[PDB]
């Protein structure tokens, strides 16, 4: 009676409405609009600091909300809280398993997440009493490697995993409150909205999904890329986000009238993007690459406004402070640079 | 403004207590020689063994310490998390080597070696390759139950190399089969040369007592070719 091939045919009818709905609202392109504004000019940054001390390659970093401290996680099995004004060190924390793939700094400055190929997120209470740092909760529910994690407050943390699921956790009870399903491919990154009611997530199918944190569903689905997505980040006002992927492109998507708006590509670039990030105003866009460079694009004109070329191996991570004063990059040569 | 100079000197001594522990941690990271053990799954850790996600077993040969990691509880999409293992010394690859009756488990092992060897980030990592699970009569040519001329259309037109060392008493046509499977590898190895890594084959059996020695004697060759390349000699 053939149930499978008419359910697979109804989805073709349902998808052709969504493509024709987005086509009906495409009254102009973005480069038709912004072709009258003045350019940004060439920019340059000069590597104000350099932070040495890791034994193996660096996979992640995260600034603090006070724009001074930062975390860094490396495959030798360490986790360092640097101070960026004076290049000192606080709290080199040793890990239980060495393959860590992500880290996060809580907005209260009280905890530090990490996780990796051991399928476990860890909490590491910093502002402690009667002792040094210690692991606190050790969340464990996933069946694949842990690829990202971000704090909401000191009791909720949303994690991304390699078993195609996102999840929302409850510290001090340990089990997960909400479990997000729907991807087909390893979820590689995430980013929260500035009001923290929603978050986006891109995976190894060429797709990105908007999720409701409080509800537990998926609102929209964005498909314009061609390979695995490795990075994502929101715009400052929260009404847009930009992705980076293996097809040497970055793209800009708006939430309302779900389609893409801009594509950041160049003919000399044949390498994949490992990180994206925005400036404070949202005019620049800073992407790391696999050919050891770090370009800078104009988010309203799709031009290229500069380059940052200081590392020896590929750039894994990237991040701009909340006041917008500096950019930190990290790479597989185990050094971090601060550019300004 | 000397009120700044109170606590930042305590910050300054908090920097030197950290650096003293990192000196003790560099000394044991620099002398531990990580290895990654991956196979098709059937042989696995039956051979490479000294008598949750990552499993972590360590051992010691000649007062030199090692690490071996078997990957478990992960999915079968390997294009990520395989590039977390690029600064290891070697990748111990285990092949069942008796795949004629369960499928074609032998051809699937060849496609995986072609993806690992040519990857991008694994271009500098040498592979120690064990051809496990001999079974010279059972499911092989000493009994003639299954034919390898039908699974590979060659090997009916192939002869044994000039210098093949048999065991005294070993079947003249099982040594023709044992060296053909090894020669399906080493032509994926000896084609591309821009990576500068190697491939080292071996034959393991049921009695593999010496099998921590052949991995010791060849991780010594891997470090030797790294230091010789520093002087532009290779």
């Amino acid at each position: 009676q053939s149930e499978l091939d008419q359910l697979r045919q109804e989805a073709e009818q349902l998808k052709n409405q969504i493509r024709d709905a987005r086509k009906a609202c495409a009254d102009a392109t973005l480069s038709q609009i912004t072709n009258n504004i003045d350019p940004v000019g060439r920019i340059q940054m000069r590597t104000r600091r350099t932070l040495r001390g890791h034994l193996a390659k660096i996979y992640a970093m995260h600034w603090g909300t006070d724009s001074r401290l930062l975390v860094s996680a490396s495959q030798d099995g360490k986790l360092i809280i640097w101070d960026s004004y004076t290049t000192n060190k606080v709290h080199a924390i040793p890990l239980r398993s060495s393959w860590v793939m992500t880290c996060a700094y809580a907005p209260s400055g009280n905890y530090v997440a990490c996780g990796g190929l051991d399928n476990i997120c860890s909490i590491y209470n910093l502002k402690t009493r009667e002792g040094n740092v210690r692991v606190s909760r050790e969340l464990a529910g996933h069946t694949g490697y842990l690829s990202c994690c971000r704090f909401l407050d000191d009791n909720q943390i949303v994690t991304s995993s390699g078993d195609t699921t996102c999840a929302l956790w409850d510290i001090e009870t340990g089990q997960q409150t909400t479990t997000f399903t729907g991807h087909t491919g390893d979820v590689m990154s995430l980013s929260l909205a500035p009001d923290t009611r929603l978050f986006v997530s891109g995976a190894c199918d060429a797709s990105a999904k908007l999720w409701d944190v409080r509800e537990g569903m998926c609102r929209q689905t964005f498909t314009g890329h061609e390979s695995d997505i490795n990075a994502i980040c929101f715009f400052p006002n929260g009404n847009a986000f930009a992705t980076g992927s293996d097809d040497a492109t970055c793209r800009l998507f708006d939430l309302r009238a779900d389609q893409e708006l801009m594509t950041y590509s160049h003919d000399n670039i044949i390498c994949g993007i490992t990180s994206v990030s925005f400036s404070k105003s949202g005019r620049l866009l800073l992407a790391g690459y696999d050919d050891f460079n770090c370009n800078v694009w104009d988010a309203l004109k799709a031009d290229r406004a500069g380059v940052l070329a200081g590392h020896d191996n590929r750039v894994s991570c990237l991040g701009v402070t909340d006041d917008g004063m500096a950019v930190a990059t990290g790479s597989w040569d185990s050094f971090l640079k601060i550019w300004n | 403004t000397e009120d700044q100079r109170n606590e930042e000197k305590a910050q300054r001594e908090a920097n030197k207590k950290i650096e003293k522990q990192l000196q003790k941690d560099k000394q044991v990271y620099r002398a531990t020689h990580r290895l990654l053990l991956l196979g098709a799954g059937e042989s696995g850790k039956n051979t490479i063994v000294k008598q949750s996600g990552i499993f972590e077993t360590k051992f010691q040969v000649d007062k030199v310490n090692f690490h071996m990691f078997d990957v478990g509880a992960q999915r079968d999409e390997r294009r990520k998390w395989i590039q977390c293992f690029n600064d290891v010394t070697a990748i111990i690859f285990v092949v069942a080597s008796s795949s004629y009756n369960m499928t074609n488990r032998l051809q699937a092992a060849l496609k995986l070696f072609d993806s690992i060897w040519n990857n991008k980030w694994l271009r500098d990592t040498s592979v120690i390759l064990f051809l496990n699970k001999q079974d010279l009569l059972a499911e092989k040519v000493l009994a003639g139950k299954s034919k390898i001329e039908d699974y590979f259309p060659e090997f009916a037109r192939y002869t044994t190399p000039e210098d093949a060392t048999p065991e005294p008493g070993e079947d003249p046509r099982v040594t023709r089969a044992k060296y053909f499977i090894r020669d399906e590898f080493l032509r994926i190895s000896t084609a591309s040369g821009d990576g500068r890594h190697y491939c080292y084959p071996h034959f393991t059996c049921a009695v593999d007592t010496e099998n921590i020695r052949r991995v010791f004697n060849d991780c010594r060759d891997i470090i030797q070719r790294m230091h010789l390349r520093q002087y532009e000699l290779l």
């Epitope: 390979s227 695995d228 293996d246 | 072609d114 690992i116 990857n119």
Partner: nanobody
Framework: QVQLQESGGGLVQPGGSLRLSCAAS????????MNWVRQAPGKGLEWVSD????????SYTGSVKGRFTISRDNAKNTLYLQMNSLKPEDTAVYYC?????????????????????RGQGTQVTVSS
Amino acid sequence: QVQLQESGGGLVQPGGSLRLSCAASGFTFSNYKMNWVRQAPGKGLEWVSDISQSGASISYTGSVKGRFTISRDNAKNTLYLQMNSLKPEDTAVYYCARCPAPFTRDCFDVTSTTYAYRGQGTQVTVSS
């Protein structure tokens, strides 16, 4: 939306012939190298052939070595597979899979269950 729609497969007598096809859309066809995989009932997915970027660098498996042939046409985003002298071992559904990244020579997750860049497949049957 990356999509790959195979067509042109059905039942035939042994010793006969059949030519499959695939129309690819959603990406630049010239940068990726393609594959063909199959799944006999009760076994699992296995690899059949591949072909590089516009190249005459073609690989086959040992079972269908002397009688199968592949061909791509980059001008129309199409991938073919001409099959001849079919045997009852060739009773499987055949998918068209591409490599995950452009301009590469490794190709990892083709013969994997739950793989993204792969069609739904076409049935090919032989019977006497």
